[PDB]
Structures are given as C-alpha cells and as structure tokens.
Design a protein around this ligand. Structure first.
Ligand SMILES: O=CNCc1cc(COc2ccc(CCNC(=O)CC[C@@H](NC(=O)CC[C@H](NC(=O)CC[C@@H](C(=O)O)[C@H](CCC(=O)O)C(=O)O)C(=O)O)C(=O)O)cc2)co1
Ligand SMILES: O=CNCc1cc(COc2ccc(CCNC(=O)CC[C@@H](NC(=O)CC[C@H](NC(=O)CC[C@@H](C(=O)O)[C@H](CCC(=O)O)C(=O)O)C(=O)O)C(=O)O)cc2)co1
Ligand SMILES: O=CNCc1cc(COc2ccc(CCNC(=O)CC[C@@H](NC(=O)CC[C@H](NC(=O)CC[C@@H](C(=O)O)[C@H](CCC(=O)O)C(=O)O)C(=O)O)C(=O)O)cc2)co1
Ligand SMILES: O=CNCc1cc(COc2ccc(CCNC(=O)CC[C@@H](NC(=O)CC[C@H](NC(=O)CC[C@@H](C(=O)O)[C@H](CCC(=O)O)C(=O)O)C(=O)O)C(=O)O)cc2)co1
Ligand SMILES: [K+]
Ligand SMILES: [K+]
Ligand SMILES: [K+]
Ligand SMILES: [K+]
Ligand SMILES: [K+]
Ligand SMILES: [K+]
Ligand SMILES: [K+]
Ligand SMILES: [K+]
Ligand SMILES: [K+]
Ligand SMILES: [K+]
Ligand SMILES: [K+]
Ligand SMILES: [K+]
Ligand SMILES: [K+]
Ligand SMILES: [K+]
Ligand SMILES: [K+]
Ligand SMILES: [K+]
Ligand SMILES: [K+]
Lengths: 296, 296, 296, 296
C-alpha cells in the first residue's frame, strides 16, 4: 500500500459516462495553435457552473501527421448532455477557433470510439453567407468558409463518443507548496496519456467539492469539508496541511486509468506527499469505479 | 493620412456602452496567476455566442502592489447585460479562480469608474458550508472560504462600470503572414494600455463579422463579405490579400482610444501593411465613434 | 521538383563531422527542466563566436521514462573539438544545471552512438568538498552532490559521439513575415525529430554568412550578400524579399536528413514561400552532402 | 526583525564592483524579442565557469518607448573584467541577436551610469562586407547591416558602467517545495525592479558556493556546506530542510538593494519559510555591504 513511501488509500475514484468530442486544431505554428486551444478550452473546468469540461489532450501533433501538414494540438470537450455538447462544439469552434489567427479545426475522434456524429463544420459554414465552399483535404470533407484573413477550414462532421468523466485522485501533502509540486508533476505525466485530459486550471483542483450543502438548501455543491485542513473535525491524516485533487476525463476507462496510474506515480516521486486518496459517491452514482489498488 | 507609408482610412470605429468588471487575481507566482486568468478569461471572445467578453488587462501586477503581497494579474470581464455579467463573475471566479492552485480574487475597479456593486465574494462564500469566515486584508473586506488546498480568499464585492465595448481597427495587408506580424505587434502595444483589453484569441479576429446575413434568416451575424479577400465580390484595395481586426474593450472611451492609437502605430511599423481601417454601423447603433483621423 | 507549389532547388547541404554530447535534464516539473535547459543551451548558436552549439532535442520526456521518474527534456551540445566539448559539458552542466532548482543531469547518448566517455559527474562531484557520494540510480552510476537546496544528482559519465553539424536549408519567401511563418513551422516539425537540434535562436538564422569577404581582407566570414535582399547585386529570384536559413545538428546523418525533410515539408505549407535551397562549399570540404532531391 | 513571521537575520550581503552593459532588444513581437534575449543571456549565470553574467532586466518595453516603435525587452550583461565584457557584448549580440529573426540591438545604458563606450555596432558592421550603411534612428547612430533576412539594425556604441555584482539573500524553508515557491515569488518581484537582474536559472541558485575549497587546490569555488541540509555538521536551524540563494546584479547599489528588498518581502509571504539570511566574506573584500535590517 505504498509508492515511494506514500500511503495509497484502498479506495476508488467514481467516474461517470459522459459525452465527449475530440478536435484537432492546426495553425501556422504551435504558438497560434495554442492561442486558439486555450481560448477554446477555457471557462471549462466543470459542468457545475461552466458550460463544458474542456482541455488539451495532445499538445504537440507533428505537422507531418495533420491533414494540412501544419502544427496541431488535440483538445477534448465534454458534457453529460449530448446537445449541450453539440451547442458547445459550435460555440467554442465558432467563436474561439474560427476567429483565431490561422487556425483550422479537424475531427480527432478515433474511429473505434465514434458513436454519434455532429456536423459542426456544416452548421458553421453558413457564416460564409452563400460564399462557403465544401472541399476534400487529405481525404476529409471540409468547408472552406470565407473570412477576412482568407479562409477558415473546418471538417464537416465531428465524432461524438461516450467517455469516462470524473476519474480522480487526491494528493495529501505536508504543505501547500509540496502538494502543488507533486500535483504539477502528476499533470506533466497525464499530459502524455492520449485520450485523457484534466479540465481544471493547470489540471489541478484546489477546491474539491461534495454533492450539495449541509447548512444551505440552494447549493448544488459545496466545499469538501472532510478534506479541508482549516476545518477542525476533518477526516485528514496527521501531518497533512494541504489537499489537491487531480480530475481526469478520458475517451474510455482505460485512458482514465492510465492517466491516474502515471499521475500518482509522478506525484509520489515529489517530496512532502503523505497519502494518495480518491473521491467517490459510495458507488451510488457513478458508472465506473477505479480502485487505486488495482492500478499498481 | 499615412503612418509610416500606410494609408489611414478616414473612418471610425463604432463602439458601445457595456457593463464591465475588473478583477485582480493573485497567486503564489505569476505562472499560477496566469493559469487561473487564462481559464477564467477563456471562452470569452464575443457575446454573439460566448457567455462573456473577457481578457487580460495588466499581465504583471507587482507583488509589492497587491493586497496580499503576491504576484497578480488584472483581467476584465464584460457583457451588454448587467445580470449576465453578474452571473459570469460568479461562474468564472467560482469555477476557474476558486479551483485554481493558490489563486485569490480581489476587486480592481478604479473608484472613479465604480457605478454598481456585486457581492461576488459573499455569494461565493456559501461554498464554505457554514465554515466560511469574513476578514479584513489590507483594508479590504474578504471572505476566507475553506477549501482542500487551505483557503480561497475573495473580496466581498466587485465594482461594476459602464465601459466602452467594440472599439476596433482593421489591418489590411499584402498577405496573411504580414497582417499577423502587424496584428501581434499592435496587441503587444495594447497590452500596456491600462483599462483596455482585447477579447479575441491573441487579441486578434481572423473572421470579422457583419450584422445579420444577406442569405439566411437564422443568423445573428455572418462573415464580412466586403473585407473577405477570397470573395471576388469585395471592397478591398488592390494589393490586399489579408485583413485582421483588433477589437478593444475598455473601462472608458479614453482607454479604448489610447489602445487603438498605440495599436495602429505598432502595426504600421511592421512590413506589408497596406491600409488601416475600422468597422462601424453608420452611426446607427453605437454610442461611441472613434475617428481614426482624430487619434493622430 | 515542387512541394505545394514551392520549388526545391536541385542542390545539397554540406555538413561536417562534429563531436557531440546528449544530456537528459530532469526536474520537479517541465517548467523547471526548461529553466535549466534554456540556460544550459543559450549562448550556443555557432562555434564561430559562441563556446558551443547547443539546443533542445526532445522537449517532453515523460516522467515514467526517466531514471528518477520526474519530468525530463533532452538537450545536445556540440563542438568541432572534443576537448572544448568536454569543457562545455562541465561548464554548462556545472553552472547551469547544477545551479538550477530541482534539476538533475543524466546521460542520454544512445549506446549505438557512443564512442568516448566524459566523466562530467565525477568531475562535478568535487564541488561536494568531501561530502559527495557515489550511488546507483536505476542501474546508472550517479554522484549525489550536497548543495544548499538538498542534492544535485548527476550521472558519472556522459557518452560522446561523432555526429553531424551543419545540415541546412534556406527558405526564400515573398516577404519577411512569410519567411518567418514558414521557418517557425519548419522548426516545430524539426522539434519532433529525435537526435536532431537547431542551435540558432528559435532554430533560425536571420543572418546566414558566406566565407570570407569581398571588401575586407581581415574578415573570415561576412553577410551572404548573394542571398541579401537589400543588396542590388544579389543572386536571389525576383520576388524573393526574405531568406532564412535553418541549421541542423544531429547524432547521425539520418537525424539531420530527417530534420531537413520534415522541416522543408512543413515550410512549404506556409503561404508566400518561393523556393527552398541549401548551402554548401562545393562538396569538397564536408564529410556529408545531403541532396535535397534525395529527401523527397 | 520579522516579516510575516519570517526571521530576518541581522547580517549583510557583500557585493562587488562589476563592469556592466545594458542592451535593448527589439523585434517584430515580444515573442521574438524573448527568443533573442533567452539565447543572448543564457550560459550566463556566473563568471566562475560561464563567459559572463547576463539576464533580463525589463521584460516588457512598450513599442512606443523604443526607437523603432517595436516591442522591446532590456537585458544586462556583466563581467568583473571590462575587456572580457566587451568581447561578450560582441559575441552575444553578434551570434544571438544578429542571427535572431527580426531582432535589433540598441543601447540601454542610462546616461547617468555611462563611464565608457564600446562600439559593438561599429565592430559588427564589418559583417556587411562593404554593404553596411551608417544611419540615424530617433537621434541614435545605428548601423544597417545587410543580412539574408533583410537588415540587422544595431546601435554604433553601447555604454558600459561599473555596476554591482553579488547582491544576495538566502531563503531558508521547511521544505524544497516551500523554498522554491518563496524563491519564485521573490524573482517575480525582482523582475519589476529596473536596472537589476538575477542571472541564475529562473533567478535562483540551488547550489550556492563559497570561495575556494577545503579538500581541493584546483577549485576557485565549491559547495557552501554550512547551508547544505544533507551535510551532517551544517549551520542550519533545525526545521530548515532547504536553502535557496537569490543573486542580484545591477547598474547601481540602489537597484540591487531595491531588488533584495522587494524580493525578500515577496518571499516571506509564501508559506514554510523559516529564515532570510545573506552571504558575505566578513566585510573585508567587497565594496558594498548591504545589511538586511537596513532594507526594512
Ligand atoms: N468538482 C470540483 C469542483 C468544485 C467546484 C466548485 O464549484 C462551485 C460550486 C458552487 C459554488 C456556490 C456559490 N454560489 C451560490 O450561491 C449559488 C449556487 C448554485 N446556483 C444554482 O442553483 C445552479 C445549480 C446547477 N444544477 C441545478 O440546476 C440542480 C441542482 C440544485 C437544485 O436543486 O436545482 C448546478 O449544477 O451547478 C450554483 O450552481 O452556483 C461555488 C463553486 C467546481 O468544480
Ligand atoms: N466580432 C468578430 C466575431 C465573429 C464571430 C463569429 O460569430 C459567429 C456567428 C455566427 C456563426 C454561424 C453559426 N451558424 C449557425 O447559427 C447555424 C445554426 C444551426 N445550423 C443549421 O443546422 C442550419 C440548417 C439548415 N436550414 C434549413 O434548411 C432548415 C440548412 O441546412 O440550410 C444549428 O447549429 O443547428 C459563427 C460564428 C465571433 O466574433
Ligand atoms: O550561413 C550560415 N551562417 C550562420 C551564422 C552567421 C553568423 C554570423 O556570425 C558572425 C560572424 C562574424 C561576425 C563579426 C563581423 N565583424 C567582426 O567580428 C569585426 C569585429 C572585430 N574586428 C574589428 O575590429 C572591426 C573583432 O576583433 O572582433 C558576427 C557574426 C553566425 O552564424
Ligand atoms: O553562491 C553563489 N555561487 C553560485 C554558483 C555555484 C556554481 C557552481 O560552480 C561550480 C564550481 C566548481 C565545480 C567543480 C568543477 N570541477 C573541476 O573543475 C574538476 C577539474 C578536472 N579535474 C579532475 O577532477 C579530474 C578536469 O581535468 O577537468 C562545479 C560548479 C556557480 O555559481
Ligand atoms: K481561424
Ligand atoms: K468511448
Ligand atoms: K493527454
Ligand atoms: K479547461
Ligand atoms: K508586501
Ligand atoms: K484558488
Ligand atoms: K466608466
Ligand atoms: K491592457
Ligand atoms: K478572451
Ligand atoms: K540543480
Ligand atoms: K554518431
Ligand atoms: K528534435
Ligand atoms: K542554442
Ligand atoms: K529587473
Ligand atoms: K536579427
Ligand atoms: K554605475
Ligand atoms: K542567465
């Protein structure tokens, strides 16, 4: 039950079925690709009060492996509801990728994961006001939409899948600096797992939540008081002054598990880490249960 | 008029009254401040189909000049509707700053611009499930909200103002590479103008719009066919193959003007620029008219 | 030969045998690895008036794949003279990696490429003033050097090879902006080639030189006036207003050839590029001659 | 004395007269300026085994405040020996700024600080092989050097001053993570002090040194074993598990004093810091003796 002297709690992450898209953004450079990505995946940490859960999947797609031969970056966007996801593909590609210097948007759902199809390009194509043209680029059906820069290229349809949302683990540490050094290291690890993304700022949740509110009636979620170090009768080990949660969404359960696995291993290499836990709902809500003890 | 041999079109930018907040994010470092900022100001280029218009104002606030003595970054968030703006202050601070490692949120509306108040901190404080405390930090009324990291510090209320939204200018260039080298240079200039921000990806709009559609009944906006270089149907000078728009929102008209002014100057120093224009609605819609000829 | 409408001159790059080292830098995060790496590889464009030629090879080495299980980046350092190379290893590891927060230095010269060994770790260990300690980390012989931060971990020996310096190609474009947009795409592509690096700023040479000088007997090298657009008597196509050179060094000839290949391909997808060429010295001096037509 | 609960040792930093140059690098964007700057200032932590001590002074010089109206960043380069300094100016401007896309080099040594001149531009201009033009740019004497990109603009002469090298303080923390969190905050603060730079990686020395060596006659510096947490006989408080040094060089004593001041204050706001100290050589060698208590 230890990884590098760090206790691994015998518990599980409780994750959920969720609708996800996966989008390849290319641009003139990695720099401009990331400009579009950040804007497009921003305001998207959690569907508690964001319109989606979004983030970067692969930060560097080689020019030679993109449809247009340009630098690319894959992102994922998810939602529990499929239509809100479709609305969110339109909004973020339409408002944040279409408007971003030089950037184009292609589907990047693997064929194996494809379940539904959304014609985002087509719906976006009407922006060209009669002047939009369909074409074929590297075997893809795309729309060339006239814009002041020149043209916006967007694939006709995007693959939608049922993914796994809310995979997670907690880093419990001797202090805030130590928990954050460990959490950034975990996230550096999760970066390399294809099919997985971490929607929170830097991948990291500094304010994990519990379903609903004890004192109040109107709140959907509230602080996880059990793991809050400034709260007097909390459920934290001795020597733990800071908790961080890494939350992971993925194309499938195996990607989420891999992300959790390599995330925890990386964290446990950084000093001042006391214990690794995970957040669940007692199996009463999720569709998935990733037991930390099974990953190693 | 010419600036460095670049024709300055004798026209105007038509800007609007808009509700704006201005928020100081501090964090343990400039790095983590920016992690929170990007997430919080992302998906926020335009209210056509984003929930807000958001972006960075001052990217470096010295530790010495913040309430808590930590590295800070000011951002602005705006909307035409004040209540959607209040909802957006809650949503972005609550979901993207509260959850971001180490980051705190303070008001940064100058007293001169303050018109309304919104008690975002207080409304956020209920997340603490009875465990939230009020306090005074550097003469500010804050809420210390217990979170797994330790505490989230957020100011009680945030100043809301009526700002100027939609200031702008177009860079018309001999090519796309040249228009973008000029636009990034403009944006580097606009960065230094306090009270102003550029909500589009990199500050830059590659797909400027017009009100409505000539062809379709279901479009709030569509592409500006008049300034589209591939639309062989258009109002662009000869030698112009690419157009970029820089759109600027500010606390007041004088900030938007200063941003426009130093933006155009910086653009006109970069090669391949043919003409500087601006977008308006014939004075039939806006509340402001910034004549390019008056700035110089 | 044409690539995306871009002419590929039937010429060759002429490259040279050069002594080379390759180093894996790990650290608590990719941020701090990059801090050490940028410092260790800067002032390292050319052996003309720099002390070495140095640059990043692989920018993200996953935590799982490093000896200490931490985020890594590999860099390469080269010199035509082996003695000077060993001194540059010691200087750059000792002054830039040892001194950098959390960074360790491990050997990353492939076994196939190794010809000689340089006991940089052993030579650095004397900094410990008696308190240094030899140890095994992951089957590697390292020195644990006590430092005020804690420890500096450095592998005992680093493998040196005879690699290839001076692979190149020129990008000839309609404008400076177009040239640099193409060149950066090139570099993003080259980034992804393992065992190759581009030592110049951003990978790119804004000021390629020719051997000797037409006016100054005392100068060994001067501006390549043949490719200078502002010289009236240049050998440039009409319509070429900018030339950039990409220079590539690598562990072997194949890595350099691969870098030129993917770099050229990437450049030719960017708008405003007229011609791709390459530099040589008549095929007489160099040990390697890489004909552009043989790449595609 | 205490700052936010952190003890401030009643000791002093002992600093030295050092020759210094200050250079304004402009380029087509802040991005490209930073590319040139990072290359020009790298391999420049300490004159112990680097060829200079170099670093960024001001990271964001607005377009309107530069001679060419482009984005700027200032850097400082220093050496204890003036002749080696002039050589490092020529080497780093010539190999790292001249070669870097879009970058120009202008003098940024304040008039008040100027003692001597170094005609770096004049010396570089011979690269133009007869095609170089002297010219005036906003009242400055520059050389327009033809290069394959277009032109390299470099000011004829650069001002040298006798500045201050070696200002410092130590951060003594409860852990490495806490030490480095405090140290980075420090550096963000120091970033904002004009005329001061921190030459080490990220501004930070993970491996502070002392004059000479106990065991080894060939070493001019070796580990500061008294502040090594893993050295059995150390002079560290119990409860100090990590020490970092911040080393500051500047144009004058005030800039260095100011940097130490704002840097210390910033550090002490970060959690897990026990003590702030500083390094000196008894007050016998150095020309400046900066007492920490005199700062606050
Ligand atoms: N996983 C990690 C994590 C933690 C956090 C952190 O998020 C939060 C979450 C909540 C605060 C509360 C502060 N603001 C408040 O006073 C208003 C609350 C509330 N108003 C609403 O009633 C809408 C509720 C909505 N769902 C509902 O429609 C049904 C559930 C409730 C019902 O009975 O109808 C929802 O899912 O959020 C809101 O939604 O803000 C701050 C930060 C983010 O991600
Ligand atoms: N300051 C610059 C700026 C510019 C921008 C850019 O903003 C915009 C503004 C508008 C857009 C276009 C979005 N397109 C849509 O609304 C389609 C709705 C709808 N599409 C359809 O399916 C049409 C169906 C159909 N009609 C019928 O036949 C029945 C048909 O096939 O013809 C759908 O999604 O369901 C993109 C970006 C932002 O900021
Ligand atoms: O083609 C690939 N190329 C790539 C490439 C091009 C370059 C550019 O390199 C150089 C090469 C040579 C210069 C120096 C030019 N001027 C002199 O040095 C005179 C200084 C001086 N003499 C006088 O007093 C006058 C002295 O004694 O130093 C600068 C930069 C680098 O890499
Ligand atoms: O406090 C501020 N200061 C910070 C600071 C610390 C440092 C770090 O500097 C140094 C200084 C000295 C070393 C040790 C170098 N060792 C050798 O020289 C061995 C010579 C060798 N002989 C044999 O041992 C075999 C041979 O033949 O090459 C490493 C790093 C820089 O700046
Ligand atoms: K676009
Ligand atoms: K699936
Ligand atoms: K990933
Ligand atoms: K996100
Ligand atoms: K302070
Ligand atoms: K926070
Ligand atoms: K106002
Ligand atoms: K601004
Ligand atoms: K934005
Ligand atoms: K180190
Ligand atoms: K080899
Ligand atoms: K590479
Ligand atoms: K380099
Ligand atoms: K500074
Ligand atoms: K240059
Ligand atoms: K001075
Ligand atoms: K440096």
């Amino acid at each position: 039950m230890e990884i590098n002297g760090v206790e691994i709690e015998d518990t599980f992450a409780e994750a959920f079925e969720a609708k996800m898209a996966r989008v390849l953004i290319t641009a003139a450079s990695h720099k401009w690709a990331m400009i579009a990505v950040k804007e497009a995946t921003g305001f998207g940490t959690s569907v508690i009060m964001c319109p989606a859960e979004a983030g970067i999947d692969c930060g560097y797609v080689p020019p030679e492996e993109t449809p247009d031969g340009r630098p690319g970056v894959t992102i994922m966007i998810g939602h529990n509801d499929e239509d809100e996801l479709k609305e969110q593909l339109l909004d973020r590609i339409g408002q944040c990728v279409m408007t971003a210097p030089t950037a184009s948007a292609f589907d990047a759902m693997p064929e194996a994961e494809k379940e539904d199809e959304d014609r985002v390009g087509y719906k976006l194509s009407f922006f060209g006001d009669g002047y939009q043209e369909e074409d074929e680029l590297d075997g893809r059906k795309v729309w060339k939409i006239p814009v002041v820069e020149g043209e916006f290229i967007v694939e006709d349809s995007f693959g939608i899948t049922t993914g796994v949302a809310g995979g997670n683990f907690y880093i419990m540490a001797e202090s805030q600096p130590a928990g954050l050094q460990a959490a950034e290291a975990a996230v550096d690890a999760i970066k390399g797992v294809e099919g997985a993304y971490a929607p929170f700022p830097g991948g990291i949740v500094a304010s994990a939540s519990k379903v609903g509110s004890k004192q109040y009636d109107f709140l959907p979620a509230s602080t996880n008081d059990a793991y809050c170090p400034t709260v007097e009768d909390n459920e934290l080990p001795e020597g733990v002054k800071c908790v961080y949660e890494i939350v992971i969404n993925g194309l499938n359960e195996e990607a989420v598990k891999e992300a959790m696995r390599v995330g925890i291993e990386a964290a446990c290499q950084q000093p001042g880490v006391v214990k690794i836990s995970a957040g669940n709902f007692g199996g009463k809500l999720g569709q998935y249960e990733i037991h930390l003890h099974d990953l190693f």
